[PDB]
Write a protein that binds this DNA or RNA. Sequence first.
RNA 1: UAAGGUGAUAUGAACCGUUAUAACCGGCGAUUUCCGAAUGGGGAAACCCAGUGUGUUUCGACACACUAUCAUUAACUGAAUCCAUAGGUUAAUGAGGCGAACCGGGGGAACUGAAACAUCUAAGUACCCCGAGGAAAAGAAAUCAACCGAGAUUCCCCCAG
RNA 2: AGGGUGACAGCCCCGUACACAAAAAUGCACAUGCUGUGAGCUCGAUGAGUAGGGCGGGACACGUGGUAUCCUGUCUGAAUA
RNA 3: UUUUGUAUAAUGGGUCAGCGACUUAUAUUCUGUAGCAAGGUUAACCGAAUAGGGGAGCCGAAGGGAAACCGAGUCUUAACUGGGCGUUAAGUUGCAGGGUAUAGACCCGAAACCCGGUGAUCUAGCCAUGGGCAGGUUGAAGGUUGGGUAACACUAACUGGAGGACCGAACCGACUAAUGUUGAAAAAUUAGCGGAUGACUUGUGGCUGGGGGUGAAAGGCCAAUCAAACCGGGAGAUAGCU
RNA 4: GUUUAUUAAAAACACAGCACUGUGCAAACACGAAAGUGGACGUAUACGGUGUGACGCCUGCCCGGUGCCGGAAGGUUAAUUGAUGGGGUUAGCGCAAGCGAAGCUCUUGAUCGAAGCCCCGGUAAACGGCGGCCGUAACUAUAACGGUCCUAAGGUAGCGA
RNA 5: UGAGCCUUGAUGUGUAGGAUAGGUGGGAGGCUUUGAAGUGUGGACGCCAGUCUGCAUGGAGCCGACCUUGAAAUACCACCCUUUAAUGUUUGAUGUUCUAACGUUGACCCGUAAUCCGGGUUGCGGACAGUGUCUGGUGGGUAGUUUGACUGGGGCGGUCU
RNA 6: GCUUGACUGCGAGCGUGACGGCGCGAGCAGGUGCGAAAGCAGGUCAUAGUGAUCCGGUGGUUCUGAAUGGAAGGGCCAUCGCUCAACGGAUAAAAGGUACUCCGGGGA
Lengths: 77, 50
Amino acid sequence: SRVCQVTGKRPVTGNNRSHALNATKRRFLPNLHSHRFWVESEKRFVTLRVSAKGMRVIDKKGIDTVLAELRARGEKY
Amino acid sequence: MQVILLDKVANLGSLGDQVNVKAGYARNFLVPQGKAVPATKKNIEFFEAR
RNA sequence: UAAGGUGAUAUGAACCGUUAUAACCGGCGAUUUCCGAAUGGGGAAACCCAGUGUGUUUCGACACACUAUCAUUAACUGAAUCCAUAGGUUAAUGAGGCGAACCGGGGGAACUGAAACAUCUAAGUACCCCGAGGAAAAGAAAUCAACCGAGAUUCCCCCAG
RNA sequence: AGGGUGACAGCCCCGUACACAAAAAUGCACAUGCUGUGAGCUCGAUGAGUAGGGCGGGACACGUGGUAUCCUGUCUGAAUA
RNA sequence: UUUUGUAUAAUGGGUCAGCGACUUAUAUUCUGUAGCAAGGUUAACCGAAUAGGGGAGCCGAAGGGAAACCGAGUCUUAACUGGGCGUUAAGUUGCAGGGUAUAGACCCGAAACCCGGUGAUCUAGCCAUGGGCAGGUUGAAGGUUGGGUAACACUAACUGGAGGACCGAACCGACUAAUGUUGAAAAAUUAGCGGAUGACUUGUGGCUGGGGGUGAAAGGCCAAUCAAACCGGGAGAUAGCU
RNA sequence: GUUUAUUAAAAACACAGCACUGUGCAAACACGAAAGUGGACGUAUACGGUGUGACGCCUGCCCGGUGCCGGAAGGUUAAUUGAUGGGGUUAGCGCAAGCGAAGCUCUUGAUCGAAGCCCCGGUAAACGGCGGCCGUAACUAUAACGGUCCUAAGGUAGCGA
RNA sequence: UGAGCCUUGAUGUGUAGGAUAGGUGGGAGGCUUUGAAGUGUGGACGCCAGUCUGCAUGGAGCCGACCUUGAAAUACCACCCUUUAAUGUUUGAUGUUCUAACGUUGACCCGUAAUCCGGGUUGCGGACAGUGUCUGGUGGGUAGUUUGACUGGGGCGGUCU
RNA sequence: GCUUGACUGCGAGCGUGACGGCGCGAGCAGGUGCGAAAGCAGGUCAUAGUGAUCCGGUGGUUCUGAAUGGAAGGGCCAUCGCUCAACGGAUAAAAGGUACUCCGGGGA
């Protein structure tokens, strides 16, 4: 799936609006990238499918803080 | 960001100071594999006496 | 509770019982083959094919019992790579499936109306999917009011076409 | 009340109104006990990639209109009674 | 029934019996009627439950003006001899009925659009495993020998069995004609006809699903249908049409 | 050979051959939200698309138009950047008429800005085009020939009454 | 290499004139023996007019309304402007190189007698490729539709005020 | 020759249309021009020279001002942009084919 693991962003739907305002269904795809992270507590390459914003959340909280949040709400990595 | 260097980093070298740096060079070179530390006011106070 | 009674089409045959163990009704139990979530492996559903432990005054051949997957926890083990991890085994607990409406969330049209048709309307309706309960959802103010105040949410009538 | 009994039944029959009855299982009330959850007082603390903003959408009666508020895919980004 | 107009040779009916088409809700207007009257009347709800209680609110007696505002007057204008609109006429609530609005809206009927499912047991193409092709001819490359050539080339015999080869059964097709046309058959029968060792044919099982599949290309095939299958749902789609 | 099962078995369709274009392999292309498969367990003597249709003689002329392939100075040009200017608001200054600081907000959009297009050159076994007006040879007809028409150029070979 | 920005120094010939006057300010003394005017060279500017300055010669002064000039001082101190040069900070363009993101349908190792995938090592690329949001061009590949009425039948022609 | 009446607010009453509209109008109120004056002038000899509405642009007017004071916006008045030519204008935006045709009604 294309669900972000850190933030939880799911693809939602939108509409094409042209000059004549004709509606056409489309979807909002996040900017997901598989980025590899080295942790200090476990000393292991931890790969995660994160968004472009979800990488910035790791920059503030820390890689050890996010993995404690993934343990609390049930997701695995 | 405001990471503080530890080891003998080359030019932009500080030997321990708050300098500005891009985010791509902070993570994966200066954060892990070392030679720096984040500045979340818990690490820089514990490494103040170092 | 009882002198009647053995479901009905459906008689017949053979009995049971009349003062408390006939039959009938209710509560608490036992039995519950095979298929179906079907869960020992498989499968053209009601069939095929095993493994482990345990039992034979006939220890050949059968019978009793267990063995799916996943999540969580605990214990024992355990790579590349020395420590570690991945991975593997066992045990306890729990989930799977079905069901008419109501509810919450995720997707979501077109016929048609505009006397055509594209914005719009039809409409977040139908349908599909996930999840839950006897209700769910919502809910104790970063809300309304206007210098006077009211004091969570939900539902009904007005405001008001 | 109603139904049946050979035609239309208060008094023929089953019932109805009323008055009682539970071995065992079970619903709901108070009463008591146990295992757990946790009062109250004072001193703090006040929820950061968040509010807000650009672009692109959706939802509030409100179709971008002079368009607030609410939701966010993308890009950024505060203040601290 | 439709029509300027029908015995019309315009449309419809075999007959009988049963069933079958102007309704319901909520709004608003007019009329009839009833209660009260410058007032009328409650909705939800409470309830000793068609009572009683509840007057939130709606309608009306006052309108002019875009509005502020003014007021039995007011607006337009600098101001009106005026003008425009009003003032000197009783409404309101039940009930019944005639209309309109929104709902299927008097009933019956499309061809079609969209979503959710079901089918390659028929047919089109393919994949894997098997089977079938009676019989009779034409005689390639090559092999050998001989003639011939300076030598090859070339030629004459036998051997050889190549072929989207020929003729012709099974088999696979369906060109002409006839019978058949409420047939024996929702495409067949009889007699001629074409391929028939291959671009063949065929048994069994699997795969490709609808705005798609597949197609030696006809807009053909896809369960006797195909210019978009089948069935269910939106759906009582819509029709200014009969 | 193949096809309009069930009006059209053919002149159609297919066909080997030829020619052009795409494609260097994680190929082009196609099915797929994606994964991945097919292409292919192949590798330019190969694959995909288009076009003609054994073979033999051959396939002339025109690059303006419409596509494609390049080239590239100038011109225009989206997202983004938000320079100046204007307006609202007001601490304050002004008996008021009015003006106005910072802050915030609104509006205008100078500059940066790629492809595409305009422009230049090739490409006809790419799509197409291959003309009019007069004069002129025998009996006629025709025009080897002689002018004009600036649309990019005017039917060659072979044939056809 | 284009640009901002921070200090440090040049740099200014309308015209008279002791003479290639930046603009306003404070401002009749600052500076020089910790060695100055005033000449002589090199580097160097240039409208070759003239000036700046290292070194050296020289060994005690230049300066002030000085009278002129629209505007008076390299007497000095401040905000600095015009032009221009160097170092240094910073933002982009162009180009080279590297690894740590990332890609690997290269080899090898382990889970694992396993063509998936995951972990690990190594090799070649490498901030490209690719993807997400925003945006211009292309786009019957596909989808929803438009395509008028009168009318000696319809269409053409023609008309609608 | 001289001037701007091609003027502002009105208008009893009437013609003409289904309606929207259109056409004539003495006189009055205010302020002008010409003529000495009586008077005349609300465009031209009349009848053609045209386009509703919606959305806006500009100017004026304290009329409204979603707590208040303003402002944006809206209203009023003035005025601009439609060959909406199918000209009482279905959209800001629209061409062909059906001998494969399929439905509904009438016709040789």
